[PDB]
Design a protein around this ligand. Structure first.
Ligand SMILES: COc1cccc(CCCC2=C(O)[C@@H](CCc3ccccc3)OC2=O)c1
Length: 133
């Protein structure tokens, strides 16, 4: 029952500062423009120890399955090939991505009826708010 409150089908409703986060990560102009339009649906499920997050949109579909604390290979929506480790810290999913000698952290939190995704690269944060679909 570890991630119960995350499970479901979620739709992006709002974003703040996402262009600057993508700049900080190194995303090029064309991908920033088309990625910034997308309103993905994120489908989170759990089966035993395995968590799956599937995202579907216009622009790109992505899918990760993982065990908490166990590093895995990920392909991001901007097409980075990263090494990722996801843990639970005080009821927040904490996701670190390493690639090309860089690092970024994505936190996923339940806040009221919303799922809040906070993305940090060095000094720059972006907040992406999802609602139940
Ligand atoms: C640095 O450039 C980026 C460009 C696009 C997305 C991200 C990740 C943002 C954080 C994040 C979500 O909102 C979900 C869903 C991501 C998603 C967006 C669009 C289409 C399919 C899936 O998964 C997460 O990793 C970074």
């Amino acid at each position: 029952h570890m991630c119960d409150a995350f499970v479901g089908t979620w739709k992006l409703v709002s974003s703040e500062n996402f262009d600057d986060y993508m700049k900080e990560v190194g995303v090029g102009f064309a991908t920033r423009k088309v990625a910034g339009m997308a309103k993905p649906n994120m489908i989170i499920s759990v089966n035993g120890d395995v968590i799956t997050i599937k995202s579907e949109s216009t622009f790109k579909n992505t899918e990760i399955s993982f065990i908490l604390g166990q590093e895995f290979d990920e392909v991001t929506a901007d097409d980075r090939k990263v090494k990722s480790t996801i843990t639970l810290d005080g009821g927040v999913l904490v996701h670190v991505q390493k690639w090309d000698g860089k690092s970024t952290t994505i936190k996923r939190k339940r806040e009221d009826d919303k799922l809040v995704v906070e993305c940090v690269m060095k000094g720059v944060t972006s907040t992406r708010v999802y609602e139940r679909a």
